[PDB]
Design an enzyme around this catalytic site. Structure first.
Site, mmCIF file in Angstrom:
data_model
loop_
_atom_site.group_PDB
_atom_site.id
_atom_site.type_symbol
_atom_site.label_atom_id
_atom_site.label_comp_id
_atom_site.label_asym_id
_atom_site.label_seq_id
_atom_site.Cartn_x
_atom_site.Cartn_y
_atom_site.Cartn_z
ATOM 1 N N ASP A 58 -22.914 2.519 25.300
ATOM 2 C CA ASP A 58 -23.169 2.731 26.735
ATOM 3 C C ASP A 58 -22.399 3.926 27.265
ATOM 4 O OD1 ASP A 58 -24.031 0.073 26.122
ATOM 5 O OD2 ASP A 58 -23.402 -0.676 28.073
ATOM 6 N N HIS A 60 -23.237 5.038 30.969
ATOM 7 C CA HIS A 60 -23.104 4.634 32.385
ATOM 8 C C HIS A 60 -22.590 5.750 33.298
ATOM 9 C CE1 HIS A 60 -24.642 0.634 32.266
ATOM 10 N NE2 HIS A 60 -23.797 0.239 31.329
ATOM 11 N N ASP A 86 -28.378 2.475 28.314
ATOM 12 C CA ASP A 86 -27.421 2.384 29.419
ATOM 13 C C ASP A 86 -26.762 3.733 29.711
ATOM 14 O OD1 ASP A 86 -28.181 -0.234 29.767
ATOM 15 O OD2 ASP A 86 -26.146 -1.056 29.538
ATOM 16 N N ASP A 89 -26.294 4.186 35.987
ATOM 17 C CA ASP A 89 -25.635 3.123 36.764
ATOM 18 C C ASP A 89 -24.148 3.106 36.476
ATOM 19 O OD1 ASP A 89 -28.025 2.216 37.991
ATOM 20 O OD2 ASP A 89 -28.299 0.570 36.573
ATOM 21 N N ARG A 90 -23.424 2.621 37.478
ATOM 22 C CA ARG A 90 -21.974 2.409 37.491
ATOM 23 C C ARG A 90 -21.139 3.656 37.670
ATOM 24 N NH1 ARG A 90 -21.144 -2.972 38.551
ATOM 25 N NH2 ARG A 90 -21.629 -4.232 36.709
ATOM 26 N N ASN A 118 -30.741 -2.044 29.120
ATOM 27 C CA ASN A 118 -31.166 -2.873 30.246
ATOM 28 C C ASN A 118 -31.025 -2.161 31.590
ATOM 29 O OD1 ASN A 118 -28.299 -3.337 29.814
ATOM 30 N ND2 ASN A 118 -28.437 -4.934 31.396
ATOM 31 N N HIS A 119 -30.268 -1.067 31.657
ATOM 32 C CA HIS A 119 -30.174 -0.278 32.892
ATOM 33 C C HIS A 119 -31.256 0.796 33.065
ATOM 34 C CE1 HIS A 119 -26.396 -1.852 34.719
ATOM 35 N NE2 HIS A 119 -26.352 -2.417 33.526
ATOM 36 N N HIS A 167 -30.201 -2.187 21.898
ATOM 37 C CA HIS A 167 -29.199 -2.175 22.944
ATOM 38 C C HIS A 167 -28.463 -3.510 23.055
ATOM 39 C CE1 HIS A 167 -27.039 -1.054 26.445
ATOM 40 N NE2 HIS A 167 -27.395 -2.199 27.002
ATOM 41 N N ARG A 215 -25.075 -14.120 31.958
ATOM 42 C CA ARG A 215 -25.693 -13.047 32.746
ATOM 43 C C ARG A 215 -26.857 -13.558 33.607
ATOM 44 N NH1 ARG A 215 -24.176 -7.825 30.478
ATOM 45 N NH2 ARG A 215 -23.483 -7.985 28.294
ATOM 46 N N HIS A 242 -23.976 -2.648 24.917
ATOM 47 C CA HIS A 242 -24.236 -3.619 26.003
ATOM 48 C C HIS A 242 -23.015 -4.364 26.550
ATOM 49 C CE1 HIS A 242 -26.832 -6.192 28.444
ATOM 50 N NE2 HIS A 242 -26.720 -7.247 27.655
#
Ligand SMILES: [Cl-]
Ligand SMILES: [Cl-]
Ligand SMILES: [Cl-]
Ligand SMILES: [Mn+2]
Ligand SMILES: [Mn+2]
Lengths: 293, 5
Positions: A58, A60, A86, A89-90, A118-119, A167, A215, A242
């Protein structure tokens, strides 16, 4: 679309001083999305890759860390790369991150690979930062362009018939690799089923078979699930991402699975390292690590 | 906030 111009501007900020943005034009980014989309659709949804290569987890939006990973590992095409998802995001610089990755995919389509995390999913973007970043720095039409591109990313890779990469993790619905191959694109990430699980599931030391995932989606899976999977499919290793892991990489199930996470000091809330896995010609694995600050 | 933060 001037890829070298775009890449040059993206790389200009090397040696800063994390913080400085690279602001490409809207038309440039649209082009990156459209051209990379085409390439993703032209290549299999289950990639069949050759070693040697570098594998990253990831990112991010930690763009300046992505640049350090390339500085350590060799800028494309000096090394072949597989990223596990990923990208957004973040973090503070999702746009720079995804734009450099897409530019490299277009420049080096047979030597540079990006899987879906998943992002790379609109409903998750909406909440976890990328929608807001696009709205602030561009507009929501460009966000939809990104989503359209994300919806065409491949889902899994197998390296030299022995390292299965994805992922998230395994799925209780995954019986045959052909089930992955049959998945049509573009597609959203569903809230259940094989594609969901590939992007969302987690290993768990405390679960025997399959367990509930805190989750609120997908499952957890134990070491015996991993062992059985490798045996059934004649594989040596599962490589996934992940989950934040302190060392940047972490083995599971007697080193039959490894989790890679490449964003150090994640969210400024963790004191984790970020790792990239080097896979040599004979599939021997070693690590390059961005130690925490 | 577990979606994972
Ligand atoms: Cl960041
Ligand atoms: Cl923002
Ligand atoms: Cl599911
Ligand atoms: Mn993830
Ligand atoms: Mn993640």
């Amino acid at each position: 679309l001037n890829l070298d111009s775009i890449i040059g501007r993206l790389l200009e900020v090397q040696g800063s001083r994390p913080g400085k943005n690279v602001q490409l034009t809207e038309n440039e980014i649209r082009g990156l999305c459209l051209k990379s989309r085409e390439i993703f659709l032209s290549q299999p949804i289950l990639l069949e890759l050759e070693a040697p290569l570098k594998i990253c987890g990831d990112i991010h939006g930690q763009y300046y860390d992505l640049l350090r990973l390339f500085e350590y590992g060799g800028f494309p095409p000096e090394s072949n790369y597989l990223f596990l998802g990923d990208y957004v995001d973040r973090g503070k610089q999702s746009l720079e991150t995804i734009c450099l990755l897409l530019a490299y995919k277009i420049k080096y389509p047979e030597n540079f690979f990006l899987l879906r995390g998943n992002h790379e999913c609109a409903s998750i973007n909406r909440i976890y930062g990328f929608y807001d970043e696009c709205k602030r720095r561009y507009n929501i039409k460009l966000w939809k362009t990104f989503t359209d591109c994300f919806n065409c990313l491949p889902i899994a890779a197998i390296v030299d018939e022995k390292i299965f990469c994805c992922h998230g993790g395994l799925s209780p619905d995954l019986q045959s690799m052909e089930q992955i191959r049959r998945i049509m694109r573009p597609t959203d990430v569903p809230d259940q089923g094989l594609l969901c699980d590939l992007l969302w599931s987690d290993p768990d030391k405390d679960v025997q078979g399959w367990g509930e995932n805190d989750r609120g989606v997908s499952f957890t899976f134990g070491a015996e699930v991993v062992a059985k999977f490798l045996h059934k499919h004649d594989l040596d290793l599962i490589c996934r991402a992940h989950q934040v892991v302190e060392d940047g990489y972490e083995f599971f199930a007697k080193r039959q699975l490894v989790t890679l996470f490449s964003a150090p000091n994640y969210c400024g809330e963790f004191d984790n390292a970020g790792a990239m896995m080097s896979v040599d010609e004979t599939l021997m694995c070693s690590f390059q690590i961005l130690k925490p600050a | 906030x577990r979606x994972x933060x």
